[PDB]
Structure of MARVEL domain-containing protein 2:
Amino acid sequence: MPDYVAKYPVIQTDDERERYKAVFQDQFSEYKELSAEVQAVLRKFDELDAHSESRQEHERISRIHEEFKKKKNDPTFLEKKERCDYLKNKLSHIKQRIQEYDKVMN
């Protein structure tokens, strides 16, 4: 179903292996760098999270909660997350293809 599957079939030659390795290395750097952002945002949520109920405070908390909901549910952020989930999948496939071939060629 996804694009890479057709693009990365069973490896036949060492040249094709080195090509797959190269793509894994480039894309892996993008993945690592992208995850770093996402995780840092999740850290942002953690720090704020890190008495008796009052009228004033409840309103302030409610205002803060709403602001975070927008941040958590942000189309651009959700796109960054979707790319990580794609890259994780793409890289596993390429790694699996190299390993399969590697087992066969000792």
In short: The chain is about 85% helix and 0% strand. The chain has one domain: 1-106. The radius of gyration is 21 Å. Residues 1-106 form one domain.
